[PDB]
Chains A and B, each alone.
Chain A
Amino acid sequence: DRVLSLPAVSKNQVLENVFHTAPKAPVEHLEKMVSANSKVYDALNLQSKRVLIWQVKPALF
């Protein structure tokens, strides 16, 4: 019964109770918010190619 003197909690249970959640990358914030502020740029810049100022306040010619 030498196995009952060993710690009963496995190494697998340590690795799954210690590294439980996949950690959040530091670049995820930059990638996601830059992909969304690209749409903020494209809609609302006055120098963006597909700007939404002429669809919203149309013109007066």
Chain B
Amino acid sequence: LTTFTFSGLQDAPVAALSGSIKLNVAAKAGKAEVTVAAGAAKAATQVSAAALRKLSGSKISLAEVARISVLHSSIQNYLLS
């Protein structure tokens, strides 16, 4: 993706969508009060506005590790299906 992105703590999801994990943000103008709740272990922190903008400074850039290639694995998945 691009070198400068403009998302974070503004029109963010205010709640989770399924009951498998519970997530609430109590966002003020400056920071946010997030408590992520997943089953046995639940965690809570205060995520800054300058942290969700600093997150896309480095990119993950996911890539598939395949046995031969990704093209071959797509053809083999079609043969299997």
Q: How many residues of B contact A (CB 8 A)?
A: 12
Residues of B within 8 A of A (CB): 62-68, 70, 73, 76-77, 80
Q: What number of A-B contacts does a CB cutoff of 8 Å give? A: 29
Interface residue stretch chosen among A12-20, A24-32, A53-61: A53-61
19 inter-chain pairs at a CB distance below 8 angstroms, sorted by A residue, are: A52-B80, A55-B66, A55-B68, A55-B76, A56-B73, A56-B76, A56-B80, A57-B73, A57-B77, A58-B65, A58-B66, A58-B67, A58-B73, A59-B64, A59-B65, A59-B66, A60-B62, A61-B62, A61-B63
Q: How many residues of A contact B (CB 8 A)?
A: 9
A43: nearest chain-B partner, CB-CB:
B80
Interface of chain A: mostly helix, strand, loop or mixed: loop
